[PDB]
Amino acid sequence: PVQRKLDPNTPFLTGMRILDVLFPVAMGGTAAIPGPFGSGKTVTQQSLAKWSNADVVVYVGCGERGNEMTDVLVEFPELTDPKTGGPLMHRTVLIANTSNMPVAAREASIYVGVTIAEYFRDQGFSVALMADSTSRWAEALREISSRLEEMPAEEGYPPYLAARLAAFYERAGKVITLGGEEGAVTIVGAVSP
Amino acid sequence: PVQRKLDPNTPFLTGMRILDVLFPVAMGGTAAIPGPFGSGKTVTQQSLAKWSNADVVVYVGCGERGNEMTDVLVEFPELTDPKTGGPLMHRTVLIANTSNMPVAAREASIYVGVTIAEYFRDQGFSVALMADSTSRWAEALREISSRLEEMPAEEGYPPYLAARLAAFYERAGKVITLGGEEGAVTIVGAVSP
Amino acid sequence: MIQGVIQKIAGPAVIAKGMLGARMYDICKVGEEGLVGEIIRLDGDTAFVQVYEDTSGLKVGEPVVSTGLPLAVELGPGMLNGIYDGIQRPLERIREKTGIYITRGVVVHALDREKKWAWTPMVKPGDEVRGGMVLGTVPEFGFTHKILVPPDVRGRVKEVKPAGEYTVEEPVVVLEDGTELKMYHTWPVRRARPVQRKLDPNTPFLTGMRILDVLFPVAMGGTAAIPGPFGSGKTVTQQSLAKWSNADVVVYVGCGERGNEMTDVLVEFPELTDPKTGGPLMHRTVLIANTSNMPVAAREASIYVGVTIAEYFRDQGFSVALMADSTSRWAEALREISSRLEEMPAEEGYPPYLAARLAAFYERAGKVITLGGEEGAVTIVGAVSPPGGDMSEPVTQSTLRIVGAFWRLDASLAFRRHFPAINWNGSYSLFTSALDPWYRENVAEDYPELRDAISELLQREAGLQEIVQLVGPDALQDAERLVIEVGRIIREDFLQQNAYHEVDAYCSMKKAYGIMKMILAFYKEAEAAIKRGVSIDEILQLPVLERIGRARYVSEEEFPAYFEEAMKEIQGAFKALA
Amino acid sequence: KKEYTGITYISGPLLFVENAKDLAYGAIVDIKDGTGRVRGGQVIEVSEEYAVIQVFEETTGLDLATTSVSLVEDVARLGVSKEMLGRRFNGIGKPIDGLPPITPEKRLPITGLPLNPVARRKPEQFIQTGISTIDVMNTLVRGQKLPIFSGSGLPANEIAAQIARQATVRPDLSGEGEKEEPFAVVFAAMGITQRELSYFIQEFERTGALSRSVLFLNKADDPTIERILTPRMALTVAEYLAFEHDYHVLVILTDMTNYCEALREIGAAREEIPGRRGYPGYMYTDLATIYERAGVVEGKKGSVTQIPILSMPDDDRTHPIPDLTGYITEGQIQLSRELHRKGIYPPIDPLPSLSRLMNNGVGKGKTREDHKQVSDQLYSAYANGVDIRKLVAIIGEDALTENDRRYLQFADAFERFFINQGQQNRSIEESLQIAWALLSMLPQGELKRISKDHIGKYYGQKLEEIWGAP
Amino acid sequence: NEIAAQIARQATVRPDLSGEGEKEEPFAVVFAAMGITQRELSYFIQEFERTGALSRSVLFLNKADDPTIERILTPRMALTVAEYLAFEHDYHVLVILTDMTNYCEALREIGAAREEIPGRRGYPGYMYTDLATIYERAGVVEGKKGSVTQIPILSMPDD
Amino acid sequence: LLKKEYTGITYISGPLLFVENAKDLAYGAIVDIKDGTGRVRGGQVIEVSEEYAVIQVFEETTGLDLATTSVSLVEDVARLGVSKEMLGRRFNGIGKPIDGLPPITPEKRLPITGLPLNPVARRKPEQFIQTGISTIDVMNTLVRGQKLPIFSGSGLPANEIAAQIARQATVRPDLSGEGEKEEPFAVVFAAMGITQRELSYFIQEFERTGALSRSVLFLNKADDPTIERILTPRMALTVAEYLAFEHDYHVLVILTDMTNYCEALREIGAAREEIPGRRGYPGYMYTDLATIYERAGVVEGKKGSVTQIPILSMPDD
Amino acid sequence: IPGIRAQIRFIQQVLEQREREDTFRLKRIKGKIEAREAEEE
Ligand SMILES: Nc1ncnc2c1ncn2[C@@H]1O[C@H](COP(=O)(O)OP(=O)(O)O)[C@@H](O)[C@H]1O
Ligand SMILES: [Mg+2]
Structure with a gap:
């Protein structure tokens, strides 16, 4: 819970030049990155995780490859965030559910990630959550829906897919917490059509 | 029942130039006007109800708006029937099963109009039957066949749909009645794809 | 063997009860007339029989007897100069019995039981015969038909009948474990006939025309595909490469097509000339014939009957050219088969296993050393014909994936009077x-x-x-x-x-x-x-x-x-x- | 007649019958209501528990208390005879002309036994239809099936009735074949309306072409299962006449699209999963069942020629009905909407039409020695006249060569003297006379596809002298 | 949403050009919203409080994280209040029905939970009847001063 | 051990057969199905319950019945017997040897599904294996411990590129810090559905220049049943992970036609009555391709690599 | 030419997708029709 949801009025400085000048997301904003394979979409997510103004970064990656997870684990403790000094890994909570790992757990990975981002939001920080391949979460919901013998709608996905997806993207926001202090959580969701 | 069915050799004068010159309709003939939403179906059928040389006109609103039946109720007594001097509302029967009325009555609404037109055919008149939205009768049959838990044909419709359509459109056609004198029903049907 | 009764008749699906112990995909006789049908979906005590013909007239309570053996072919002497159909029922003797029509339930045997052959053995009692070993000869048409032991039978021989004029039912040798061996044997048309070593293609199938062996060879034991458009000279090319071929047994498979498009095969083919002796070509050719109004299961099984007969002739040590015309017709017969079995379709309407069935057809074709110890080949020049005239259906794509040569006939060249009409810009080998x-x-x-x-x-x-x-x-x-x-x-x-x-x-x-x-x-x-x-x-x-x-x-x-x-x-x- | 009372489940068209093991599969039943009205039905799904019956008509007065089913004619037959050559029937075979019922010489099952492919000849002799652009450029031969690929608004019933009242075998063009072979037309009209039914009975009683033709006409408010059974009745009367009395039979099947829609709705009523684009999976075999009941037979003198007519649903040849029909039949002749709006009858463009079995049934002894070469030259000359007509819109009349203006005038004269026939009846001699009068417009030496003997015999003829089309 | 709020803040009847005299009767506003996230809701309530309309409006709000089945009852109870205020107290109610595509996917959810045969693209066969029973509850009646005008908003999926 | 043959089949429809009161079978167990003649088939236990368990039969169910058919239990987890002398031999799609030689005396029997690697134990691929192809050397670069597909077509030579970079690819340590004796190299080559022409072509290309003494072959013809085409990449990657993470090889794996693997997966996946995805391919095909692509890579602590080249033809380009 | 061919191939593939969804729903409803008799027992 919160006390009050505010309006976003301060940009989320992604450190790029096309994603903050021409098409900016604010601090309590929600953004979505589509794109086919070989079109970036991983270096942009890692650039959001490296060069941002956010205090903490929750990097939840569900359904994608593990070389990216070990890349983030290898090359973050050598870098330095340009806010307080010290290692870059001392502000990242990273949740990995690789594609060879079980498929009903990447539903839970997204909720675990956004609950951790809301926990660091409820203290006064400005969390950035990078939710990577939410389409693989839609495929996990398709898997359990077809295992449960439900009617599909539009290529196998369950009819409550848009409701679950809206209830995930609705948790991002610029609020004042119950402690009086203000906080924010932004969500960048990479979708892989 | 009927004594004989003549072959048609006399046009149903609509009044519109294209529909009477290039694509005519005989007095014992059927006709079908499909088109998307906003194309000109209901204005055309009210034009046929307003200007054609039918002795009586049966207007069957089968699952359409209430404002476009209120128009026919309000502004027809202000007009004058051709071939006589009495007002235009004095020659029309108006069956009106609108959109928010119960859906199971649309089959009954599309049959009550054709049997009233057959009754005025059996008196020696020349009846026009403007039935709009036979596709709404088809959709009503689909909604009631869902409750019958049957197996449908293409698009969801029950498989007896074209038998119903053939039995509906076959009830027209320039007859010599049981009383010896001749009459006709001509059916103009709007289809909404 | 196992005799149940009908309990339900829905379309061509007869649910017959009583048959516990019947086998799956096993031929059985449904009805008092005798209707051939294969057994699917054993459920408890019952069995669902897919019947080949129309069931209109069957009542409930009629006997269903079981054959015991799957859809098989009767391999033996008496097949050359033979016009069979998709489940190997000789059409000429049906013409001899029942006039110009094919009444349902005509039971004729695949081989002539009344024709007397001239046996000459090459075993002697005390010999030890393993499978594939040739145990006698019979002269058929100037064509030494070498009678084989069936390829999964072995033992010690005795009671070899002397060199005389016998018939195809009489057993010629008897093993020392019972087990008489006749002049014929039934082989299931879907399992491949066993061999000992597939060789590699390094010897060409000499076609006869100097484009399809110079520019686009096919390499005996190989596999080609030809498209058939109208007005391309298709039939004259098939007849020329069956007349002037490198092979010495020809097996033609018309797998369900127009009536007028193969009744001018059945009248133009037995007047050709074998250009090595002088007699007609039908003395070394077996011809499977289906029109498009035959039952679906025969029209789907015709190519497997063709390949099994051609493998019987490679097992003797011969060179067989199998030309299976119009494989797309077969593929939509398979699509109709899968539509009555309630399966989820694939890319166009096709089953998910279309290319697996096509691989099972085409890959049963190679230069081989047999179980007897001598080489033989089943080179397949099987054709294709999509209905649109474009080469992006699932059938033609799967065929181009699994063949080794493609010979694009185009109707423009035969319009230009360039015979044969092989386009070389689109063919490959x-x-x-x-x-x-x-x-x-x-x-x-x-x-x-x-x-x-x-x-x-x-x-x-x-x-x-x-x-x-x-x-x-x-x-x-x-x-x-x-x-x-x-x-x-x-x-x-x-x-x-x-x-x-x-x-x-x-x-x-x-x-x-x-x-x-x-x-x-x-x-x-x-x-x-x-x-x-x-x-x-x-x-x-x-x-x-x-x-x-x-x-x-x-x-x-x-x-x-x-x-x-x-x-x-x-x-x-x-x-x-x- | 041992009627089965005690039923359950009337629903839709179907009704279940308890304790009916003696009903054979495919049998026909009479369903008597408590009022006394008798309906007809067909038994499907017979079992020990219950037998399903699909009712022909509607199920209105039926109830579970007063209803009885009785067996009639345990497989569907018709009584066939020679004395039915001037009669009208409705789908099942009841006479609708008011004349007394026929006395059946035989009682034949209506479903087809397939011909034995050993026992078929090659279809080698021709049949004229009177229509010049069917007789000359893509000939129908005796033993051929070929459809007319009509369109939506196009006049297919008119060409059906014209070919019906105009077809004739001419044995004079052989070496004096006798006229002891008679000709007969079987005409199955399915899915038709009242208007076009009145049109066919007017058209067949007008010219007197009803004495050699037998009609199987059912309307659209008739049951759809009668639309299934109608081509079976037509083809078994055809096979009876042609293989028992040596007739030359022409089977005209009007609106094969309506048959396919009836088949789809009966499959979905009998509760089975459709295949490709909603049409049933068994459609190829069930459609080759009534396409492949045509052709000559060895040892018999008679023949069954067949013209199915079908409308493409939105004028495309990739729909399953014309796709499978052209995948069974021998070519097609295709009506064009463009020539009909231009105003031309019969509106047949010969550029997408094709007779796959034409070249067998023409030549010396069949029609004339120049028939194939005249057909090929007219096809090439019209095919390169149309694109010159399309080209002159952007270049200009004077800025073409001589030969291009000659082909343009050829195309202009062709599609209003050769195709635009009207209802004039042309034999093959008048049709080839008009064809050589059209080829005389192009100069000699440009007629490349004709032998010089035929050019020396026939080149040079006025159009305003022959009066075949003045 | 900006176009709907602009229409809601500057729609006025013209009594002088019509010829019915003059009173300048303003609009009551019934605002039904089904899955507005937080940004659309913030824009609408700031626009309404900036133009001074929340003393004339009644709002039936349903946020994006609220449960997705009460979207079935949201437009019906908005238009119940609209029919009441127009036809028994003679107001001039303007009804803004936000984002009907969320209502249609809510009824697709409850119609695919019940295994019902769909129409096109998975939406059930009675969606015409539900959208009709919502929409057709508007207009003017005879001899009574009221009116229910409707502006729905639709998000066309692939536009 | 002890053999426990279940009798009492109740239903056999497609590849599916229902064994009743088979409570003692686990999910995903491997069974063999003895016919009433003596011909044993294989199958896998799906959908275990208290009243029936659904065996999916691997081969075709021709000849089975309800009286004489037995279902035994063979090795609950699908293991493979792997030893180190496999280098230089040819195998079936399952793993049985087809070269005229006696089988493998196994050193270790490890499963073929393979456990997922832990992303804190994986390290970065940071070195260089050199193929002979100049583009794949200079402009693109096959890093030691990654996977990269070769997208090809129909009339495009992809088998020849496979047989080329299978025989002339090597790692060269003399440009790095040396240890040249320390690191050996090996090739695992799995062909999934090939013409006999392609079979003889790869066997000639591997016995022509002495390239077979480094490599292991898991060839699969199109005559073979579809379950061998499903099981081929898992056998090849089991042998690859053994040789890379037990003896410090630098295994290069070539999966030469993944399109036939996907078509075999679509064929065997239309038996669970599950709605397919895009064009008939199943909804779980991302997870099934991922469970055989993610098994590449390098692990910290070790020195071995698994480097995958999936070659696949676009069905249309 | 290839732009129109790509649009045609895209539309044909998505129409085949909708047809395959419809023939999945018909198989599901036929199983649910059959379950009525097995519950009738
Ligand atoms: N024949 C016409 N003449 C003049 N205006 C027309 C005509 N047809 C349509 N319109 C205009 O377009 C609107 C179309 O309404 P309508 O035809 O009822 O749509 P639909 O046919 O989809 O129900 C009419 O309200 C009118 O404003
Ligand atoms: Mg309207």
């Missing part, structure tokens, strides 16, 4: 790199180099065809007009071939090599004549080109008396110029 040492030994050591040279000239003519189409051949430079004229002489002499001619119907490798070297020598000597500066006009009107024109209308008895003199005339008439 992958057996060129593997047939190299056979060419190097048995033809000449330089044969692939001038094969690539003629392919290079036919590449460059169609490469600069656009300038000829935009302008006309009289305004090309010098050498480009030489390219179009030598490509023209390649087309109008070498590639084109009259199948109805006396001696142009067949062209061996030596004759093709001769015309090949003659054309290429004329090209790369007239090129040097242009390098002198001689005008193009005196090269074209020149009397030695008549020799290259009638290079192909020459018997191969007299081609080593013609090739040398023409090759001397080319050098003479190109050293006489300035």
